[PDB]
Symmetry: C2
Subunit: 48 residues, 2 copies
């Protein structure tokens, strides 16, 4: 469940990054988003 | 302010990753943590 909580936070996090990127085209935000996508993939993997 | 809100989420998230690493020494969690610290420094930088 602790991993599920980290995942849930990561999922909430990306929605916020994506909303900013709807309005401002800042590459640093797309860069962070890219890492968050990987964070999410690793958590899903270790959760099975 | 939207950047301050992303920074807040990142700071709340880093605390959850740090607590799990107190207990389970999973390199994948430390890999995420190292990225999050960079996310935070990037937000601090662009906020000035
Ligand atoms: Mn909003
Ligand atoms: Mn993350
Ligand atoms: Mn706890
Ligand atoms: Mn992050």
């Amino acid at each position: 469940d602790y991993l599920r909580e980290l995942l849930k936070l990561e999922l909430q996090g990306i929605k916020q990054y994506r909303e900013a990127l709807e309005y401002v085209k800042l590459p640093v935000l797309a860069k962070i988003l890219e890492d968050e996508e990987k964070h999410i993939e690793w958590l899903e993997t270790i959760l099975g």
